[PDB]
Paper text:
Within this cluster, we showed that a [name]_u1 protein from [name] (LlGH31_u1) and its fungal homolog demonstrated hydrolytic activities against nigerose [α-D-Glcp-(1→3)-D-Glc]. The kcat/Km values of LlGH31_u1 against kojibiose and maltose were 13% and 2.1% of that against nigerose, indicating that LlGH31_u1 has a higher specificity to the α-1,3 linkage of nigerose than other characterized [name] enzymes, including eukaryotic enzymes. Furthermore, the three-dimensional structures of LlGH31_u1 determined using X-ray crystallography and cryogenic electron microscopy revealed that LlGH31_u1 forms a hexamer and has a C-terminal domain comprising four α-helices, suggesting that it contributes to hexamerization. Finally, crystal structures in complex with nigerooligosaccharides and kojibiose along with mutational analysis revealed the active site residues involved in substrate recognition in this enzyme. This study reports the first structure of a bacterial [name] α-1,3-glucosidase and provides new insight into the substrate specificity of [name] enzymes and the physiological functions of bacterial and fungal [name]_u1 members.
WT LlGH31_u1 was crystallized in two different crystal forms (named, crystal forms 1 and 2, see Experimental procedures). Crystal forms 1 and 2 belong to the space groups P21 and [name], respectively, and comprise six and one molecule of LlGH31_u1, respectively, in an asymmetric unit. The P21 and [name] structures of unliganded WT (named WT_P21 and WT_[name], respectively) were determined at 1.75- and 1.85-Å resolutions. Despite the space group difference, hexamer formation could be generated via the symmetry operations in the [name] space group, and the hexamer assembly is isomorphous with six monomers in WT_P21. With molecular assembly in the crystal structures, LlGH31_u1 probably forms a hexamer. We performed a structural similarity search on the DALI server using WT_[name] as a query. However, the superimposition of D394A-Koj2 with WT_[name] shows that the estimated distance between the Asp394 and 1-OH of kojibiose was 1.2 Å, indicating a steric hindrance.
Residue numbers in the entry:
A (entry chain A), B (entry chain A): 11 to 739
Amino acid sequence: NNNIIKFDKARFTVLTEHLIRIEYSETGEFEERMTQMVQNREFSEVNFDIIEKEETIEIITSTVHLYYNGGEFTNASLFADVKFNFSVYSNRWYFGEKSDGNLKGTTRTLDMIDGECPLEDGIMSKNGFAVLADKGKVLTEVGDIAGNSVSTIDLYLFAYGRDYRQALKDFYQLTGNTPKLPRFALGNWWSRYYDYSDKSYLALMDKFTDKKVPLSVSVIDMDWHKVSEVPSRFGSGWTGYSWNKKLFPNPENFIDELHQRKLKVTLNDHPADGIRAFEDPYPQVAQTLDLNTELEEAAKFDFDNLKFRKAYFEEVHGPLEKEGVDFWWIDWQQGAISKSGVDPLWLLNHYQYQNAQKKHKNNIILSRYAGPGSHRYPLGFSGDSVISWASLDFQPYFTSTASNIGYTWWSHDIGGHMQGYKDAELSLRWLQFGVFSPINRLHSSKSEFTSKEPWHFDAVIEQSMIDFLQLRHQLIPYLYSANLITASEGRALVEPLYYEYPMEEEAYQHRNQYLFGEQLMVAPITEKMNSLLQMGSVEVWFPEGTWYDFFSGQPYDGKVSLKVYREITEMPVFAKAGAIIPLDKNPLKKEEIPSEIIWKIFPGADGEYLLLEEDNETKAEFVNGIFTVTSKKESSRKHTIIYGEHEIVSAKRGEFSIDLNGKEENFDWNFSTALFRRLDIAEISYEQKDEILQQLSLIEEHEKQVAFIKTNENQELQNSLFELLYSGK
Amino acid sequence: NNNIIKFDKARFTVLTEHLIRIEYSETGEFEERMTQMVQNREFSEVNFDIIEKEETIEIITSTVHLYYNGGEFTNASLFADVKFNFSVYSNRWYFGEKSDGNLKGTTRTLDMIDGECPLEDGIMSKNGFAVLADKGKVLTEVGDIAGNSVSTIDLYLFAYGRDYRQALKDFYQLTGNTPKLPRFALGNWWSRYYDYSDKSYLALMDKFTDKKVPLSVSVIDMDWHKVSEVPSRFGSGWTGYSWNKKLFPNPENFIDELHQRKLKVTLNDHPADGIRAFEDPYPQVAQTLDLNTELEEAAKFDFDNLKFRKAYFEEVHGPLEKEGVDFWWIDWQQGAISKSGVDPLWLLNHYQYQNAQKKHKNNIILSRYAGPGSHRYPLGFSGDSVISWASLDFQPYFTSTASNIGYTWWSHDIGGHMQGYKDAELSLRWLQFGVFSPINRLHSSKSEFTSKEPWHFDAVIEQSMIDFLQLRHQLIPYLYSANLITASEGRALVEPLYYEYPMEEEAYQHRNQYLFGEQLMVAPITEKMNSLLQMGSVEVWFPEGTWYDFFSGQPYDGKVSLKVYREITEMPVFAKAGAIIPLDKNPLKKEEIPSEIIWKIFPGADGEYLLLEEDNETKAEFVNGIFTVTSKKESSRKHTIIYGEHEIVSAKRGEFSIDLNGKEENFDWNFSTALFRRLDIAEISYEQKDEILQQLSLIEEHEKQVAFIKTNENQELQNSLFELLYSGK
C-alpha cells in the first residue's frame, strides 16, 4: 500500500489520519496475520506527508507528527507530538513511557473487590492520544493460535484528539465489531449459588410469574453437578460435568419445562480441574484422549490442545447441550498460565463463543474480560464483587469507562456477589442501576441470607424491585435496537458523558453519570439515603437544553450542576425535550417481539427514533408537532402514543401520522405537590415543615423563595428545596 | 533406586508417599551430596504409580499427582494436584508460584521489631502442600562448603495434607534431627547489657540465691571485653576478645566462682570486626595468619576461610574456654555478605555448634535463625525485640509457628530487649510466657532502667516473678523429657493447636494458644489488664474433653471458645482429666537430677507419662484409678503423689503402686469463692458488687444465673461472670 512506509528495521502503516501501526522486525519480515487482538488492517486510503532523511523519518497527519530516529525503539528514538493543545506539555508520546490523560478502560474481574480497583488504560485520552500494544499471538486463517508474531514490536498509535466515538468505531474496524446479541440476553436473568432441585427451581420460576416479574434467562449454578458427592481423592467438587441425580433426576425434562416457560438455560462451568475419572463423560473422553483409566488419569484442562477442546465441546458440553443447555457460563478464576503463553481465559472465551454459534444463531457466553478485542465474545461477567455501598458506587463508572476499550456488554452480579453487609436499600439501588446497565442478571453467594428475590425484602422494597424488573422488560425494544447499533455502527449502549460532550469539563466530573442509548441520561444514586430527608441524592450535570425526569416529568434547564434527591423507590433518569422512547406495552407477555409499543414523547422539540428489530425497522418522527410512524414491513403491531402526561392514541394498527400541536405539552409535575411530599417524609421538626410550607407558598418572587431556603440550618434540606425551586424557576 | 525417575533433564525421587525431590540438571549429572539444608535422602521404599509418555510424565502417590511436560521448569511445565479437598481451587502447585494456605515458619530475628513482622513459609499448609526449595551450597563428607550443587534446581514437594506431625518428622529425617540439649539449657538464664565487675556479678548471683530464684546460666554481655578503652583508629568496641581487666582482673577465678555455684557461663561474641591489633590474642593470630603487625593488619572476619576459622576457635575462643567459658553467644547483626554466597550467620552457627562439641557433650550455641536445617545448631536467639505489649502479643504465635520449619528452641529476650515503655505488668506477663517457652533467658538493653531482676519491681510483681522463676525449675524434668522426644522422635515441645486438632477450625483461630509438651495447653495473657476488673483475659479454645486450670483446678467442659480472666499474678495453663505432670519437688536444690519428683495427677480419666532422663526412664501410669511408677534402673529417688487437691504419698522410694479410687477426685475450686474474689478486686460500684453477689447466691437455676449476668451494663464483667458460671455448670 502507499499507506505503508519502511525505515531501518521499522514499518509504519497509516490506517487513518489518526491511527498508525508501528512495527519492529529483527528479521526484515513484518506480520500480516491476524492476532488475538487485531482482526482487520484493511482501511481506506488516507493522505499524509513524510519527511524522510538519511537517519530520520517523520510521518505527518492532520493530528500527529510521528518521529523515528532509527535503531532499536527507545523513548529517545521513537516518539510523537500531537497537533492539539489540550495540555501545556503532555502532547508528546514517548515509546515505552506513560503520559497523563488516559480515561482508562476495564480489567478482568471485580472478584474480591470491595469498591474501587485499578483499571487498565483504554484508547481514550483527554490529551488526544493513546498507544495500544499488540502483545498477542498470531492466529491462523480459521482462528487457531499460530505462535509468535514476526513483528516483535507491534503498536497502534491512536491520535483522535477528543473524537472518542470515531476512535472506538475505528478500534472496532481493527479488532472486529461486537457481534449482535440475541434479544433474550436483554431481559432479566435469575441466578443464585444455591442447591435447588428441579422441583424447587420450577416452583421459583412459577413464583416469579405469579409475582409479575418477567424473566428471559434461568441460570443454574454449580450445585447442578456433583459437589459434596465427589470423593476427596479427586480433589474438590468445584469443577463438575455430572448432574446431581438427587436434585435433577431427569435433566432434559427439567430443561424442557424451562423452555416451555420461554426461558433460556445456562449452567455454571468451572473448567480448571478438567474431566476426572468419577465424571459421567469420563469413559468417552478417556477413549478419545487415550487416557489410562485403571490409573484414573484425568483429562486435565488444556485449551491449547486441539483434541482436549474437541472432547470438551463434543463429549463434555455436547451431551448437556442435547439435554437442552442453551449457552455456557464460563466461571474461570484459576489464573493466566498455559504452555502457549495465551491466557486460558482468552482461549475459553474465543473457542467457546465460536462453538456456541453451532447450536444457536447469535448465541452468547458469560465470561470475564480477556483483554482488548475480547468484546468479540459477549457477554462480560465481572464476578465476585463484595456486597457494599462502595462496590455499587464504583459500578456505573466501571461500566461506562469500559466503552473506552470497546467492552460494552458487562454483566455485573446485581446486588453484589458475596461477603459485605445486608441493607435492603443497597439491594434496591443496585437493581435500579442494573436495569439501566448492559445486562440485568440477579446473582448471589452461597449464603442462606443473600437471595435477590424481591419478596426476600419488606413490602415497600419488594414492590419497587418488581416495578424496576418490569421496567427492564419494557426497555427491551430500546436495548435490542441499541444492541444492533453496537454491532453495525460501533456505538456503545453505555457512554461516558464526555463521548457526547468532550469539551465540557463537567462531563469528566460526574463519574457515575452516563448516556444510556441516545435518548436517556442516567445518574444512579449509589449512596445510602440521608435519614433526615428520607431521600438519597447525586450531583447531576445537565447539559445545555431542557431536560425532564423520565418518570416524573420534573423539568431542568441546562447547563447546570444540581444535586437531585430521590426517595429509595425512585431513580434519576432524564430525557431531553423531543426525546422519543419506545416501551413494550406488555412486558409480562411471553412473545418473541412486542405485539404493542408505547411511543413516549417528551414535548418541546422535534425528535426521532429508529426501532431496529430482527425482521423490521420502524421510524418514529416528531417534526413541527406532527408524530409519524412508518416501517420497512407491515405488521399487526398496535402503537400507543403518550405525549408528555396524556395517552393520545391507544392500540392503533399500521403506519400513521397524528398532530399533537393541539395536545397538552406540559407534565402534571408541580412545585407545590413535590414540596409537600419532601417535607412530609422528612424526619425533621414539624415546626420547620410548617414554616417552610407556609413561607414558600406565601413568598411570590423566585429569588426571595431561594433567599428563604438559604437561611435553613439543615444544609442538605437547603439543597433538596433548591432542586425543587430550580425546576420551578 | 526404584524410587528415582529421570525424564528429559529432570530427576524425581519419591522419598515418601507425601515427599518428592524434584531436580533439574543442564549437565545430566544430579546432586547426591548433602547441602546446608539436607543431611539425608535415605528413606524406606514406597509404592507409587507412573504414567510416562513420549512428551509427559505423571507421578501418582496416595496424596499427589506431579506432572512434568518436559523442557525447562516453568509454571506451565511443572505442577501438581493434591488428592485432598481442603479448598475449592487452591489444590494445585505451580512451579515458581505461591499458593494460599501456608501456615508460615520463622525468620532470622526480631531485632528492631515492635510487635509483628513477616515470617517465611514453612512446610505446613491448610491446603495440604508446600514446596521447600534447596538453594544452598553442597557440603563435603565432613561438612565443609564444597561449592554449587550440580542440581541447579532442587525442590522438595511436601504433600502431607494436614498430617503436620508426620511432615515435620520426615523433614527432620531429610534435614537431620535436632540434637539433644543439655539439661542446664532448660533452667533460668540471667543476662543484662550492663558493665558488671567480677564482684558485682557474683553479688547478684548470690542475691538470686538469697531471693530463692534458681538459675542454670550466667550470661556475661559485651562489657566483659574492652569497649570505651578501644582506640578509635581501630573502629568501635562492639567486637572484642580481650577482658576488661578493671572489671575482670582474674577471669578464670571469676568463672571458677560461677562454676562453684553450678552455673554455666557464656560470653557475648560480636564477631564482625574480627581480631584487630589491640586485642590480647592478636600477636598469636597474626603469626598464624601471616599478618603485617607493623601496619597493624587486622584478621578480618572471614568464616569462608579455613585458617581464619581455626585461629578463631583455637587462638581466640580457645584461651577464653581454658579460663572456663562453657559455650558461645554468637550475636551477629552485620548482614548476609560473604565471597562464597553462604550467609556468615549460617557459617557461624554450623561451625561454632560443631566446635562446641569438642569441649562438652551435647553443648549449645545461642544464635539467630540461619534458614531451614539450622535447627541442627540450637539454641535460637531472636534478639533485639522492642519492649512492648505488641511484641509480647506476637511472641507466642511466633514461637509455636516456628515448629512448622522445625526450629523448636527459640530463646527470646524475656521482657523484651530495648526501647519501648515501662510497665511492670508487661514484664510479669512476659516472664509467665517465657516460663512456658522453649528457653527462659532474662535479658535487656544497655539502659539503667531495664533490669529484669524481680526486686526491680514492687512487692506484688517481685513475689509473682520469683514464683514463676521457681516454676521454671520445677518444670525442668518435663522440659528435659520433651527435649529428648524432640531429638529422638522429631516432636516439638511447643506445638500450634492444629498439630493435635488439624480438622478443628478453632485450632487455627487462637494464634497465641499452644500445646506445651503433651500434657499442658497454654493460653498466655498478652494484653494489659482491664482496670475495672483488675484482670487480664484471653479467648481460650477448649478442645473436646474435661480440662482443668493447672494452678487452680477450675474445670472447663470442652468443646467451647470461652474468654478467661486472670489476675496479673496468674496464667491460663490447662491439663486434661488423666494428665500426669512430674515436677521437681526441690527446684532450689543444686543437684544434677531431682532427688524427689512430685507426680501431679488430674482426676477423671486414665493417663500416663514417661519421664526420660540422662540415665533412666520412669513410667507413671494411671489406669482404673491405680497409679503405678516403675523405672528401667533403681535409684534412691523419693516420689510424692498429688491427686487433684491432696498429697497422697510423701517421699516414697523405689517402684510402687497405690490405689486412688478411695481418694477425693474433686479440687477445692468453687464458684462462690472465685465469684467473691472477682467482685472484691473489681474497681466497680459497691452497689453492683452487692447485687451480683446476692443475686448469683439466691438464684438457683443455672440458666437464670446466666440471664441475670446477661443484663449487666459492664460487657467485660458479664464475660468474667460467664466464665465462672460456665465452669460451675
